[PDB]
Symmetry: C3
Subunit: 341 residues, 3 copies
Amino acid sequence: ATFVRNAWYVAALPEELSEKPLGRTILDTPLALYRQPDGVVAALLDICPHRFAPLSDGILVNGHLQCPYHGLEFDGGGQCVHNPHGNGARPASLNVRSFPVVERDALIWIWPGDPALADPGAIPDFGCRVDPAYRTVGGYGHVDCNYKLLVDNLMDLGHAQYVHRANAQTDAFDRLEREVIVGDGEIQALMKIPGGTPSVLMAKFLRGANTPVDAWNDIRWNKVSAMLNFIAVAPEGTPKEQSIHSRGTHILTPETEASCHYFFGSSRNFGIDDPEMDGVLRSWQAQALVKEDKVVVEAIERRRAYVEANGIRPAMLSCDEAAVRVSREIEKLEQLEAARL
Amino acid sequence: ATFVRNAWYVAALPEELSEKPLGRTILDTPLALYRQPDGVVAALLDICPHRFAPLSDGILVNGHLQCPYHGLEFDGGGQCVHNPHGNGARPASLNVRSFPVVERDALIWIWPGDPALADPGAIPDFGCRVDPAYRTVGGYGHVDCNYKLLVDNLMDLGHAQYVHRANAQTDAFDRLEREVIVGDGEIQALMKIPGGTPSVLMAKFLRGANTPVDAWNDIRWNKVSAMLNFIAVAPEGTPKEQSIHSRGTHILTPETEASCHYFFGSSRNFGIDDPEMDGVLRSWQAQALVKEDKVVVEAIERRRAYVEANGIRPAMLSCDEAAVRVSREIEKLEQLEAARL
Amino acid sequence: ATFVRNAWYVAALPEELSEKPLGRTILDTPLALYRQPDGVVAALLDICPHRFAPLSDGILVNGHLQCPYHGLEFDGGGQCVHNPHGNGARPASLNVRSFPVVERDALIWIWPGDPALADPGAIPDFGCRVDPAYRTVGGYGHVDCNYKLLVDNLMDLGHAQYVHRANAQTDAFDRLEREVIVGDGEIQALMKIPGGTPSVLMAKFLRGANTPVDAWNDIRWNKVSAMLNFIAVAPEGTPKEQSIHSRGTHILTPETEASCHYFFGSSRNFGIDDPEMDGVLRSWQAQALVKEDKVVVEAIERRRAYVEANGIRPAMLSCDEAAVRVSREIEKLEQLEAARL
Ligand SMILES: COc1c(Cl)ccc(Cl)c1C(=O)O
Ligand SMILES: COc1c(Cl)ccc(Cl)c1C(=O)O
Ligand code: FES
Ligand code: FES
Ligand code: FES
Ligand SMILES: [Co+2]
Ligand SMILES: [Co+2]
Ligand SMILES: [Co+2]
Ligand SMILES: [Co+2]
Ligand SMILES: [Co+2]
Ligand SMILES: [Co+2]
Ligand SMILES: [Co+2]
């Protein structure tokens, strides 16, 4: 019910789209997503203007999406280009709503709000996903929880030990200086852990000069729910730029009030020509989502009714600064938008 | 919530009933339908007056339906004929509601509204279903959509050109000529496809024949939601009257606000003793009706919340006259009834 | 929505609890139930004070329940005993709600209401369950009906003549004699079946029986929804006291407004060292209690919307005295509680 509609959201990964329409709901809005013959992606409201049939169940006819019910045909902009009935007249009432869409950084971005306010330049920067110097692997996941629970999750390092123990684990609670930098529509949480233990994968690409001052775990948040992290390791006192690292794409898109779409990916600068490494990284990310984070957040969503019926508020700990700030920024965006409705 | 209760609806096909009660909900009213030992069908509110147990889960005892909970027995009129407890007294408070019911034309009709207005003069004529000159085959289907969506569907048979493409597509669709006749309590939509190649289905009716043909697809609607179509095909310019045809029964009965019962059938005057022709008609009913149409209308029902939340209204085409008129007649019946209670 | 929270309810059977937490909802309240290393049972609100994760999905760490999300640890009283984050401070806001709990008579009792009013001395007496002179076997069942429908069911044991026809029908039902004893927070219904043929079940307990049989079916109800019955059968003219019997535990605990937990058991004074009798009772509990009654009450729950929408009230028979009285006592408790906010 309460979404920030005036913002860019990822609706799909390029590989998911083709001439066969994909029906997907974004912010309670049903969409028909498909790639036209010229290769350009189109996004139409998945509701035919005639009698409301799902356009996503149709097929392309001469490059145009044909409604599966009575045959009306539409172009990528939503204009009805063919009416096979009667005099074949095509009044403006037959056009279907079209959404601004941009394919960039191996992501399909969509603006579900006021179309007059959609500026391609305000789209988050995920350039690493299409940089020849990086190898990117990823996927899609559906989760039955409000998207804000997963934003909280991604902005927090404290559950790694208990939720992702299979991968991330430690035994130190005396050393932890994470700085949170608040910008405009952007927030970064930087963490540098000297003497940090490199991953099993990034270790294979290290020669030898371990010295307490060489491990990073950072994350950047952009307007609403798009995040990119930075997991890295270095020899000694070398800068972040010259380290072995992976930039992780973690973008959430609300489906309904209690469900969301999760687009994940890893863009690494090591083992670039290792095909079996691709399967590995993609599976661990999938595991971290499906088999672990999903279980936790879906259980929390199931407790929302009780917490709201009663007046229960969360008790924050020292590790919640970044999440709390992002949570507050999203709230402000919800209010700023409602102050127009 | 909004149903036209003062009208006759089909609650079951004769073959579905026996001494074993059938529990079925009609217009949000749970019914217990069964055939008494004398062969007469009975319809009782499926709620025992004592503690509300489902009478439909009981069995007949000496021709009377016995409640499975504490044994009260009832006759076809809903009168409690036996109370096995205490002095065995049977006060009027123990009688269960009974609904007017009429078995006619191989259909079981029921009046769910004001029993004092049960006007049998209003039972639609489906005589072809029991005419020895016709062969009838049919079935039952349950659909998760408001019944009005299927009424719309059946009054626009032209959708077959797209929804039933593989069997009904016709190269002469663009030469279609339709008219609409409005009479006393009845609306008819006539369609004619002249001098074209028979569709895949029509070919089977003519036993794999080619050569130009004239087609007719007419449909009659009667008060609320009972329809009978006319599908005919014949060579060149032969008389519509002396043509090979099938009269299709298509009757809808609301179950809940968002679900309905669909009773379909085909009464043909050709291939009367041909088992393979029976198979062709049954294949068509299972594929087109039970599958194809269901997919479309159920997807539309899922889009109702969005269309209502926003102020979206349908855009009518030249082929919608008949459906729009029936839709308006049903609306008037809803208002005339609401102005009563 | 309307529950009598100020009363003791059974939340589990001792055998269901261990160091692995059991998540269960009682009166719309999610609980985490577990046995601490010292063997004492604990009951905490299954919602972590930090971010609301289910504590029931956690494990015990050094005798304390650890939240599976970020590691907070709690003691049986709900006090946070360990915070692994930052300075490890533990403000009062980190404690979780704990519920008064008492393990007695092989039952786990919990007080879901005002903790200040919980008095262990008001817990129903089910001593037979731990008396060395009796052999007790039982189990748990979940039912999708408001708990009051099952209380009604248990207070009218006469339904067994029809609902459990195959197992308990007696040909002397017509000569039954009832008595009802009313007390403070207690109501008893007595039934006597004089000189009849033993039912299939009673014959199983007796291991034969030629001569006529006297059967007793008594049941005691205590404040809210805890019942204990008395099933006895004897030959020719043996008195009820000095005889062979089983004391049946039948306790219901509301889960939601339309669902409940059913704890059943049989404590017999015959065949104490007989495995075959154990099977007979478990077979009965599985068939009659978990299958047969469930079908009836769940069907009734499905008819509640219709009966309420219309103004339908139940018509009582001569066998409803006990049930009606308990129903009235429960209503009074609901009102007395609603009158104090
Ligand atoms: C849906 O109406 C029909 C059409 Cl348009 C073509 C062929 C048949 Cl068999 C029917 C039928 O009555 O089922
Ligand atoms: C449901 O109460 C019973 C009746 Cl009515 C007959 C026999 C038995 Cl064993 C029980 C029981 O305690 O489950
Ligand atoms: S609903 Fe799309 S053309 Fe009719
Ligand atoms: S509920 Fe039908 S006789 Fe009791
Ligand atoms: S939700 Fe329990 S420790 Fe964070
Ligand atoms: Co074009
Ligand atoms: Co996580
Ligand atoms: Co009779
Ligand atoms: Co159709
Ligand atoms: Co301790
Ligand atoms: Co510590
Ligand atoms: Co029973």
